[PDB]
Amino acid sequence: TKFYTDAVEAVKDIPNGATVLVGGFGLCGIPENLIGALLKTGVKELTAVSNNAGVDNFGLGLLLQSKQIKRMISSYVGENAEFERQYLAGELEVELTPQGTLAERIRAGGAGVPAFYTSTGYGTLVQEGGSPIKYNKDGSIAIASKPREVREFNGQHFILEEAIRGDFALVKAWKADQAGNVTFRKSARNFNLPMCKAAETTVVEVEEIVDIGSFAPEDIHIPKIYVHRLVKGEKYEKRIERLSVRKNVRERIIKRAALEFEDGMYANLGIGIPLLASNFISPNMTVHLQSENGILGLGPYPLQNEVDADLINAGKETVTVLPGASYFSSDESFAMIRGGHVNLTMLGVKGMGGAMDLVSSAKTKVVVTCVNRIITEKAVFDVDRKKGLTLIELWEGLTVDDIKKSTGCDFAVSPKLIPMQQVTT
Amino acid sequence: TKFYTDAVEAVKDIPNGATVLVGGFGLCGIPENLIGALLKTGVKELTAVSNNAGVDNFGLGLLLQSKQIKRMISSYVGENAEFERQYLAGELEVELTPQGTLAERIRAGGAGVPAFYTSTGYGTLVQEGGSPIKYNKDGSIAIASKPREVREFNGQHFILEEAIRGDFALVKAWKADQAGNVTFRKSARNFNLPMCKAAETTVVEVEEIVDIGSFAPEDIHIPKIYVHRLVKGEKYEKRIERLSVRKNVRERIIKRAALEFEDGMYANLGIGIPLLASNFISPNMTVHLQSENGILGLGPYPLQNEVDADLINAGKETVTVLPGASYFSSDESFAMIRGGHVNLTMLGAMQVSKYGDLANWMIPGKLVKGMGGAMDLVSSAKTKVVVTMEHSAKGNAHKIMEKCTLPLTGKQCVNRIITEKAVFDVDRKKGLTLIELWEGLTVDDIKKSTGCDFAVSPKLIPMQQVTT
Ligand code: EMC
Ligand code: EMC
């Protein structure tokens, strides 16, 4: 690996039209200095592979503001009006690809695998194709997405995805030793790790450079072999997108969803009612919360002094982690998810993020507040792919008619129908 | 994760016929106590997915000795006589699958990926199929290997491989905290890490259990979510397979192969002349040696005191590691190799075609031990493949001929041939091309010993050698 004292010198040779992998999840683990360097060189017509597009005034958004990006390959581009603007006006190309798929396609690109199968996106516009990649100067679709080949394996359907590689990779890491090995801090890992292996030329910026020997050989997240160019970032704005500090119809659902948790259970909860339900978990009960951006053992929102920019949940909120928790990369995170290692997944044109991956495994129970159970203010429906909807719980005071009145499709009724349950304490 | 004080209680429910993933590389990182526990329960008809078969009296070999194994899925099974006898007697089934492929198929099995493509094994019996997975007691073929689907991507050919999953996984690890998170020590990692994610029930044995907080959250190799059953191993025999301690025709090739090394180069060297050549590397030159079992930055053989059972090279030899070295799992190791991140791959070989094809890992009826990681090492075009071998065969037969009398390792994957007599450059479209000749020999001499024709470089020069 070659060390650079100047960030612009490290990215000076990036050609216009090049496809560049950019690390980061939200504003966590983004290569600030390298992005700032691209603003200096002014390289354009870039195809940026980044999970998100940062925000309007920070992260990848900056390259959108300077219009140096021709195409974005991401999983979620919300919280950025500039993107929407350029996207709709038909001046920006964008491939909305599932997060887990994005992570795995990048890993494949670095592992010598040209293509693989995944159930993520099956029976979706990802698979079916037709999704608008680009609009025309008005509102008409110029470029559409091509369909994904489908194939069956052991009785299940999967779609074929191809490896993603870049000419360059702009990666953000924590430390680098003098040999070129690097490590990542907390959840600022995400896409930086795999992206570091899938480009002709990888450029890594770090907060600190230590001596060879500072790292235990077993704990080097990225071996020097993958680090082509290394630079120590000049400045680091520990920017937070959503500061979440700690100090009814909605209440019914929450108090009911809370009954879905079980001791020793591994679950992934979407921000909103699902996550809020975790607050009503018996202290005697142990539930391990997983976060698709690379965390196992999510804790409560931090106190003002606990706040850390390198630690946020999938919803982009600052969080804490409990004892016995662990961090890992985005590709490892979705292998965990795709592989059905998560017991329960409870959830409520910006992209699908990791939603499709979360419901991609048949070994994972999916509860809505593809699907296994639906919890709502009025009732609880069980779901069988072969039998269909089936009311199993009804809110005290309501009648099957009330449900029928509000429900769209018909549904069966369990001879065990009981009033909706609620967490005692 | 559930902790067990008794190993047999942790594996007591394994059904006969179950497929079990068993970690380890050679005798490095093998779950001794869990294997010992299987001997106690006596479960049989097992399909064991294990990179190797240990040795006759240790590791997986013990289950072969007790005949509890019906089928073995591995990449290399040498050094186990009981294996060889049972297989030839048609009492043991075996699927020899490339190491890198085995590692990736297991990862796929844990990552929800049913199938994927790899160039490893293309233009090989791995692709062709037909090989004997099992013999009949009369010598005929009871079970043959199926072909692998082929497909082209960006102008290259790849074969389709399917994910591997097990009912149980027997994993060996270093430490576990009270929450269930585990870490691995040095190169004892290999297959243990990925196998830990590809089974319905994983059983991990550790040498020590520490308190939650002992591990930095960033450095947990295997998160508790993958550890279903955990047990502290009762005893641990730090068994070494090949103790390697530090204190000609072969010499020519070595002294010439040493000049191939370049400063800042990442290389993988096969034990033998390729590895021996690293000894002649200018102290001013920096070469990083990669080991397929999960090491970057291999050092010299250890001094008697340095010897560590958790640290061996791909050749199963005890080694040391240099400053700034790193350890990683088998699937990561081959992602590195398959992805072409290694700059130079130098190995020995039996035959090499005028286009890059190579044969060096098997002899049809006199050496059916497996390809190990040989096919993965030549799978990338981005990696320069350099073969170092003696010019001719026994009665002076040809080795750099037109076709492979022996089973191919990889189609047009070799870039340079270094021998006692000459040095050939290899282009997939232009063919062989002598570029260096040993001082004193003539182009005729070469033509005499060489198999198929070859061009001559208008820059031909006397074969180079290292020194000051
Ligand atoms: C095909 C059930 Hg989402
Ligand atoms: C054609 C790459 Hg060996």
Cβ neighbors of A248 (< 8 A, separation 6 or more) are none
Q: Write the single-letter amino acid at A274.
A: P
Using alpha carbons, select from B207, B348, B331, B342 the residue that is nearest to residue B274: B348
Q: What is the CA radius of gyration of chain B?
A: 23
Q: Taking CB atoms and an 8 Å limit, are B225 and A119 in contact across chains?
A: no
* Residue B211 buriedness (CB in 10 A; 0-12 / 13-18 / 19+): exposed
Give the count of alpha carbons within 13 A of B218, CB side only: 21
From the CB of B412, is ligand 2 less than 6 Å away?
yes
| CA B25/CA A47 separation, integer angstroms | 42
Q: Where are the domains of chain A?
A: 1-233, 248-418
If one counts every other C-beta atom within 10 angstroms of the C-beta of residue B181, the result is: 30
| CA A34/CA A48 separation, integer angstroms | 13
Residue indicated by tokens 């699927």: B95
DSSP output for A87-147 = HHTT--EEEE--HHHHHHHHHHHHHT--EEEESTTTTSHHHH---EEEE-SSS-EEEEPPP
Cβ neighbors of A235 (< 8 A, separation 6 or more) are A32, A33
Integer angstrom CA distances of residue A411 from A252, A373, A400, A417? 22, 13, 10, 13
Strand B455-462 versus strand A265-269 pairing type: unpaired
Q: Cα(A147) to centroid of ligand 1, in Å?
A: 18
If one counts every other C-beta atom within 10 angstroms of the C-beta of residue B130, the result is: 10
From the CB of B455, is ligand 2 less than 6 Å away?
no
Question: Which ligand has its closest atom nearest to the C-alpha of B355?
Answer: 2
Q: Are A39 and A50 in contact (CB under 8 A)?
A: no
Using alpha carbons, select from A261, A269, A265 the residue that is nearest to residue A313: A269
CA dihedral A40, A45, A49, A55 (to 10 degrees): 60
3-state secondary structure of B69: strand
CA dihedral B43, B47, B52, B58 (to 10 degrees): 10
Q: Write the single-letter amino acid at A373.
A: R
Supply the CATH classification number for the domain A248-418: 3.40.1080.10
Give the count of alpha carbons within 13 A of B50, CB side only: 34
Angle of CA points A321, A326, A332, to nearest 5°: 125
Cβ neighbors of A247 (< 8 A, separation 6 or more) are A303
Chain centre distance of CA A2: 31
Question: Which ligand has its closest atom nearest to the C-alpha of A372?
Answer: 1
Residues of A with catalytic roles: 292
> Do the first three CATH levels of B1-233 and B248-461 match, i.e. the same topology?
yes
How far does the CA of residue B421 sit from the closest CA of chain A (Å)?
Answer: 34
What technique was this entry resolved by? X-ray
If one counts every other C-beta atom within 10 angstroms of the C-beta of residue B304, the result is: 9
CB contacts < 8 Å between A and B, how many? 175
Q: What is the position in ligand 2's atom list of the atom closest to the CA of B378? A: 3
| CA A344/CA A267 separation, integer angstroms | 5
Residues on chain A touching B184 (C-beta within 8 angstroms): 218
Which candidate in B218, B226, B328 is best for mutational testing of the A interface (most A CBs within 10 A)?
A: B218
Residue nearest to atom 3 of ligand 2 (CA): B413
Q: At what angle do helices B330-338 and A99-111 cross, to 10 degrees?
A: 70
3-state secondary structure of A83: helix
3-state secondary structure of B282: coil
Q: Show the 3-state SS of B305-356.
A: CCCCCCCECCCCEECCEEEEEEECCHHHHHHHHHCCCCCEEEECCCEECCCC
Q: Are A327 and A294 in contact (CB under 8 A)?
A: yes
If one counts every other C-beta atom within 10 angstroms of the C-beta of residue B166, the result is: 24
Using alpha carbons, select from A374, A373, A376, A370 the residue that is nearest to residue A358: A370
CATH 3.10.20.30 fits A1-233, yes or no: no
Strand B150-153 versus strand B156-162 pairing type: antiparallel
Q: At what angle do helices B99-111 and B330-338 cross, to 10 degrees?
A: 110
CATH (one of 3.40.50.920, 3.40.1080.10, 3.40.30.10, 3.30.70.1380) for B248-461: 3.40.1080.10
Residues on chain B touching A323 (C-beta within 8 angstroms): 179, 212-213
E strand or H helix that includes residue A364 = none
DSSP output for A191-254 = THHHHTTSEEEEEEEEEEEE-TTSS-GGG-SB-GGG--EEEE-S------SB------HHHHHH
3-state secondary structure of B262: coil
Integer angstrom CA distances of residue B56 from A31, A390, B82, B86, B325? 53, 59, 6, 12, 32
Residues on chain A touching B330 (C-beta within 8 angstroms): none
- Considering CB atoms only, which of A111, A151, A325 is closest to B335? A111
* Residue B425 buriedness (CB in 10 A; 0-12 / 13-18 / 19+): middle
Token reading at A216:
């235990």
Residue nearest to atom 2 of ligand 1 (CA): A370
Cβ neighbors of A159 (< 8 A, separation 6 or more) are A117, A118, A119, A120, A121, A122, A126, A127, A148, A149, A150, A151
Q: What is the position in ligand 1's atom list of the atom closest to the CA of A371? A: 3
| CA B17/CA B68 separation, integer angstroms | 9
Q: Write the single-letter amino acid at B434.
A: L
| CA B42/CA B35 separation, integer angstroms | 10
Catalytic hit among B95, B292, B317, B420: B292
Cβ neighbors of A268 (< 8 A, separation 6 or more) are A289, A290, A291, A292, A337, A342, A344, A345, A346, A358
Q: Write the single-letter amino acid at A29.
A: G
Q: Are B391 and B419 in contact (CB under 8 A)?
A: yes
Residue nearest to atom 3 of ligand 1 (CA): A370
Integer angstrom CA distances of residue B292 from A94, B153, B241, B359, B376? 39, 26, 17, 19, 10
